[PDB]
């Protein structure tokens with residue numbers, strides 16, 4: 001990783017982590033945590049999962065209860081993180097938050113509308129397959145220019161790897177970004193603990209880790225996807241935990257809001 005690897009203190013290391021955990025239950029006064037994102041018809045998962053977690057950490061660590069960090073700013077402005085709507089790099093996203101900073105979604109609201117991701121929408125959202133969205137130009141003022149820019153930064157960023165690092169980081173500091181290999185069987189997930197069994201490789205996908213538990217003897221992670229609440233289990237999926245299912249334990253990205 002381009003990031004330094006997380007080191008836990010002796011006290012953090014010996015915490016006896018519970019058999020289940022849910023970020024929204026751990027920090028009930030942090031309203032961003034249960035909010036599910038919609039990346040729209042743009043391959044910006046890397047920036048949306050990052051911004052969502054950054055928002056959550058503003059509340060779990062940074063003393064700010066309800067600031068939504070702008071995924072739009074990240075995806076348009078961190079040209080070196082990757083290629084905007086054509087995908088990008090979670091670790092570089094967190095580094096940018098530390099080196100450069102991000103405005104809120106009040107300053108720069110997400111530029112792309114709700115759409116239905118691999119299903120028919122009860123809300124009446126058009127299918128994402130109908131939209132042709134390029135990366136927007138980076139803007140350095142608010143969309144409404146009478147709103148003053150407030151640039152938010154982290155003071156440090158770091159990488160996590162493996163089941164214990166993930167559980168322990170989540171327990172102490174709250175949601176963070178992870179990535180995994182998407183196969184076609186993931187797309188129609190609705191319930192259960194996901195495990196890859198069929199379907200072709202479709203690409204890498206970055207998502208926000210929020211909890212863990214065990215369901216009928218099967219350990220899992222609880223993950224917030226970015227495909228709105230109509231996908232999966234109210235916008236979430238559970239996925240197997242412990243043997244890096246689809247690579248999901250191979251690398252997490254995090255940091256600490258100032």
Ligand SMILES: *[C@@H](C(=O)N[C@H](C(=O)N1CCC[C@H]1C(=O)O)[C@@H](C)CC)[C@H](O)C(=O)NCCC
Nearest residue numbers: 042043044045046087088117179203204205206
């Ligand atoms: C991650 C990403 O955005 N992935 C895509 C995605 O979720 N999309 C594309 C169109 C809307 C939405 C959808 O499928 O409903 C897609 C390739 C998943 C099948 C992005 O590609 C990226 O940055 N990946 C690298 C992460 C390390």
Ligand SMILES: [Mg+2]
Nearest residue numbers: 010011012014
């Ligand atoms: Mg001690």
